[PDB]
Design a protein around this motif. Sequence first.
Motif, PDB file in Angstrom:
ATOM      1  N   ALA A  49       5.972 -13.837   1.358  1.00  0.00           N
ATOM      2  CA  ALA A  49       4.686 -14.043   1.674  1.00  0.00           C
ATOM      3  C   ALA A  49       3.931 -15.350   2.317  1.00  0.00           C
ATOM      4  CB  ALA A  49       3.899 -13.546   0.329  1.00  0.00           C
ATOM      5  N   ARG A  50       4.445 -16.339   1.717  1.00  0.00           N
ATOM      6  CA  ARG A  50       4.032 -17.891   1.875  1.00  0.00           C
ATOM      7  C   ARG A  50       4.628 -18.152   3.396  1.00  0.00           C
ATOM      8  NH1 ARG A  50       6.794 -21.068   2.452  1.00  0.00           N
ATOM      9  NH2 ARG A  50       8.599 -20.266   1.455  1.00  0.00           N
ATOM     10  N   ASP A  51       5.950 -17.803   3.750  1.00  0.00           N
ATOM     11  CA  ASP A  51       6.233 -18.041   4.994  1.00  0.00           C
ATOM     12  C   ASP A  51       5.525 -17.288   6.176  1.00  0.00           C
ATOM     13  OD1 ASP A  51       8.416 -19.691   4.084  1.00  0.00           O
ATOM     14  OD2 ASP A  51       9.885 -17.979   4.475  1.00  0.00           O
ATOM     15  N   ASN A  52       5.308 -15.975   5.933  1.00  0.00           N
ATOM     16  CA  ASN A  52       4.577 -14.955   6.735  1.00  0.00           C
ATOM     17  C   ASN A  52       3.089 -15.319   6.617  1.00  0.00           C
ATOM     18  OD1 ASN A  52       4.141 -13.062   8.851  1.00  0.00           O
ATOM     19  ND2 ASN A  52       4.140 -11.359   7.588  1.00  0.00           N
ATOM     20  N   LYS A  53       2.453 -16.532   6.606  1.00  0.00           N
ATOM     21  CA  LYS A  53       1.175 -17.224   6.325  1.00  0.00           C
ATOM     22  C   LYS A  53       0.159 -16.393   5.439  1.00  0.00           C
ATOM     23  CE  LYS A  53      -1.070 -17.529  10.351  1.00  0.00           C
ATOM     24  NZ  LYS A  53      -1.363 -17.587  11.894  1.00  0.00           N
ATOM     25  N   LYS A  54       0.644 -15.666   4.290  1.00  0.00           N
ATOM     26  CA  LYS A  54      -0.191 -15.028   3.266  1.00  0.00           C
ATOM     27  C   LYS A  54      -0.030 -15.883   1.849  1.00  0.00           C
ATOM     28  CE  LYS A  54      -0.557 -11.036   6.272  1.00  0.00           C
ATOM     29  NZ  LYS A  54      -1.898 -10.900   6.763  1.00  0.00           N
ATOM     30  N   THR A  55      -0.277 -15.192   0.667  1.00  0.00           N
ATOM     31  CA  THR A  55      -0.145 -15.551  -0.618  1.00  0.00           C
ATOM     32  C   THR A  55      -0.156 -14.161  -1.558  1.00  0.00           C
ATOM     33  OG1 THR A  55      -0.821 -16.941  -2.490  1.00  0.00           O
ATOM     34  CG2 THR A  55      -2.470 -16.026  -1.255  1.00  0.00           C
ATOM     35  N   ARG A  56      -0.841 -13.405  -1.245  1.00  0.00           N
ATOM     36  CA  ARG A  56      -1.062 -12.082  -2.312  1.00  0.00           C
ATOM     37  C   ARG A  56       0.257 -11.051  -1.931  1.00  0.00           C
ATOM     38  NH1 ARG A  56      -5.558 -10.501  -3.291  1.00  0.00           N
ATOM     39  NH2 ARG A  56      -5.572 -12.139  -4.795  1.00  0.00           N
ATOM     40  N   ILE A  57       1.163 -10.962  -2.937  1.00  0.00           N
ATOM     41  CA  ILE A  57       2.385  -9.789  -2.696  1.00  0.00           C
ATOM     42  C   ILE A  57       1.926  -8.606  -2.659  1.00  0.00           C
ATOM     43  CG2 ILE A  57       4.337  -9.238  -3.565  1.00  0.00           C
ATOM     44  CD1 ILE A  57       4.925 -11.982  -5.054  1.00  0.00           C
ATOM     45  N   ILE A  58       2.258  -8.019  -1.582  1.00  0.00           N
ATOM     46  CA  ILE A  58       2.242  -6.338  -0.984  1.00  0.00           C
ATOM     47  C   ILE A  58       3.304  -5.770  -0.581  1.00  0.00           C
ATOM     48  CG2 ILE A  58      -0.410  -6.497  -0.806  1.00  0.00           C
ATOM     49  CD1 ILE A  58       2.054  -7.099   2.011  1.00  0.00           C
TER      50      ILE A  58
END
Length: 53
Positions: free
Chosen positions: A5-14
């Motif tokens: 998530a953090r690597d792929n420019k996000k933070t909310r786990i989906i």
Amino acid sequence: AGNAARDNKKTRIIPRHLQLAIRNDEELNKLLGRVTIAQGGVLPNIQAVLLPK
DNA sequence: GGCCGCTCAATTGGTCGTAGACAGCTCTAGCACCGCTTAAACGCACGTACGCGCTGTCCCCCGCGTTTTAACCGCCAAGGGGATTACTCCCTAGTCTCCAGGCACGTGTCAGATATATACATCCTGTGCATGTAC
């Protein structure tokens, strides 16, 4: 999954981040195998040889 | 020049013995299953409380009908890499043997971690609200 998530420019786990956690590591990939993830999709794979010269 | 005469080395036919492997025992012994209990908890029947899933009309990017083309399909014949099969020798797989040792099971009695009666308490699920992440 949180690193994916953090690597792929996000933070909310989906569910996509769970599919990225399962399919990058061969011992998760063998443990889960043929089981399926709701809206997790498939791990990125534009196939070799079909990838143009 | 040709065919058949006596001999003896030759396939081609029935009982003996065995060994595999069931088949049916032929019992027999034992251990589960059946019988007839005493009993209580899960399932039904029953209604009740209610989301939840059908079924109604709106509305846009998606479904679908025709356009050229260029790279992919697939053919055809070249062409050379390599698989099969020819054959004999070599060697290690098969086979059964047998030892002697390990260790799987048998089987005995003891005892400790478990089920569970019931008595606690704090753990963590439904609902609400505050507010910030992915779109």
